[PDB]
Structure formats: C-alpha cells, structure tokens
C-alpha cells in the first residue's frame, strides 16, 4: 500500500496543479509537464520576478519559448547529481554571462556589491525551501 498511497497522493497533487495551470493558460496545447508547472511555482515563489535581474516576469508569456527559463543556480561541481533543489527561474535575456560561475561568483559577493546584496535579498524573501536558499547563496 505505501507505494500505492504515495502514487495516489502524487496524482492528486498533480491534477490539482494542472487544473490551475489550465485555468491560467486556457490556450496552452497539451497537458502541462512537470517543468511547465515548475515555471509557475517558481514564478510564485519568486514573487513574479527574474531571480538574476529582479525584472518582472510577464505571466502571460510564461510558456513562450525563449522568454523565461529554469536554470541551475549552481554547476555540477557543487552538486554531483541531483543532491540539490537549486533550480531558479530567470528571464531569457538575463542568464548568458553566467556560464559555470556560482551566483556568489557572478554577483561579486566578496566585494559585497549592492547587486550581490539585492540578489541575496531576493533569495531570502523568496518562498524557496530554507535549504535551497542556502545552496543558492554558496
């Protein structure tokens, strides 16, 4: 039963989430996949803002290819495989200079840049799991 109980709980969670997704996006073709739901959940968890730029995300355009993307805030040098949850939502036009740097690196943490401070503030007021907030901030 325990496997079956878990299956059924996970079906219920996902139907509920898909239902909202369809409400929001009545013209979307096909059932949302896990990643589609995840863009919506990270949109909510980040208070509707790109985590790297702090720019507002147009929810209307959430499913537009190119527009927003889910990135790994960290490279696999800090997560062998899947020991993390460090997936963040970022606008298309804000995550190319990042390459394989961590956010600490990219945002000039050691200098305590004002943009490092802002990034940190967006992480900490986010609704990400406490542990995710920590991973992200090196």
């Amino acid at each position: 039963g325990e496997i079956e109980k878990r299956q059924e709980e996970n079906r219920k969670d996902r139907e509920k989430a898909a239902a909202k997704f369809r409400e929001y996006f009545p013209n979307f073709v096909g059932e949302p996949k896990s990643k589609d739901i995840l863009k919506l959940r990270l949109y909510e968890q980040q208070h509707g803002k790109c985590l790297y730029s702090g720019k507002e995300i147009n929810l209307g355009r959430l499913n537009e290819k190119g527009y927003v993307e889910i990135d790994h805030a960290l490279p696999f040098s800090r997560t062998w495989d899947d020991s993390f949850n460090n997936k963040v939502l970022v606008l298309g036009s804000e995550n190319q200079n990042k390459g394989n740097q961590t956010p600490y690196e990219y945002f000039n943490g050691k200098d305590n840049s004002r943009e490092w401070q802002e990034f940190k503030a967006r992480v900490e007021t986010s609704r990400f799991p406490r542990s995710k907030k920590q991973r992200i901030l090196l």
């Binding site: 969670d13 409400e23 909510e44 208070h47 509707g48």
Partner: protein
Amino acid sequence: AFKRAIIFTSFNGFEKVSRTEKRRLAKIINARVSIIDEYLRAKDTNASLDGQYRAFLFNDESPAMTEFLAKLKAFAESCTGISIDAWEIEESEYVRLPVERRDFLAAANGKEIFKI
C-alpha cells in the same frame, strides 16, 4: 487578464469565533491552494487566519474568481466574529510592488470588492 484576489481575514470581537468557523474558513481557502501556491495554505488557528493577507492568483476569463469570492462572502455573512475584506489588483501591478508587506500594499492599491 491575470488578477489577484487580495483577502484579509480578521477575528473581530471578544465573543471568540468557534473552532468550526475557523475550519470552515480554512477549507474555503484551501480549496484554491495547490503545490503552486502552497504558502497560501490555511490552518484552523488564530496564527494562520487572524489578521492575515492572502493573495489568490486568478485568470478572470475563468468563472473561478467570482465563485471563490462568492463563497468567502457568503461565509463571512454567516459568521458573527469573522470579518473578511477583499480587493482585486492586476497581476502586472502586483508583481511590481515591493516584496515586503506586498499584500498590505496591494490592498491599499487595489479596488475593493467587499467587506463584511
């Protein structure tokens, strides 16, 4: 169009709200809650319900927003000491507000729907 139903629930009066009134409110709330907006989850307690803002995302092209508002309003109307105040705000304006006290600010900046 995307909008937020901003909801403020408060326990008025010293003739305390019953535990089952709290449960009924938490259920109307939790009907709209999914993994997407897990933070909105309500418990049948003072800590979770009293003096708290919640911001429910809707596409208003759906009849859902009106059904949700209808339930909350009818519920508040059946209660003696649970006050409910509701505002709408466009999502584009909502996400532009500060994160800190966002809902309070959305409540000052939106169109008031009802207050019971």
